[PDB]
């Protein structure tokens, strides 16, 4: 039923051919998963500004790893925030009828 320990290794081999790096993006979800500041799944989409080859390098090196992920937390928290595009508080509800 429910997923216990969301593993990234087995997660990869847990999806069809082309569904390789489909789920956990390239390699950021695994890295962000480690931190989980804002949202691993969504954070990944943002860091995805680089080549799949760069994210691999960072994943094998904390130096570049945190470099990109860390930034994510700052940027995304700012850019990737709550969509304030909601309705106005001055919305007429009561219709002045007879």
């Amino acid at each position: 039923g429910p997923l216990g320990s969301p593993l990234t290794a087995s997660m990869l081999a847990s999806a069809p051919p082309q569904e390789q790096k489909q789920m956990l993006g390239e390699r950021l979800f695994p890295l962000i998963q480690a931190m989980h500041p804002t949202l691993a799944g969504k954070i990944t989409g943002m860091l995805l500004e680089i080549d799949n080859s760069e994210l691999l390098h960072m994943l094998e090196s904390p130096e570049s790893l945190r470099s990109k992920v860390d930034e994510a937390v700052a940027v995304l928290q700012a850019h990737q925030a709550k969509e304030a595009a909601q309705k106005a508080v001055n919305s007429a509800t009561g219709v002045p009828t007879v």
Partner: peptide, 22 residues
């Protein structure tokens, strides 16, 4: 001080290694 980061808020997260070439 409102400087951008290394990993901006790029698009969504898709299959990076989409190696579906047969």
């Amino acid at each position: 001080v409102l400087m951008s980061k290394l990993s901006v808020n790029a698009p969504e997260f898709y299959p990076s290694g989409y190696s579906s070439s047969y």
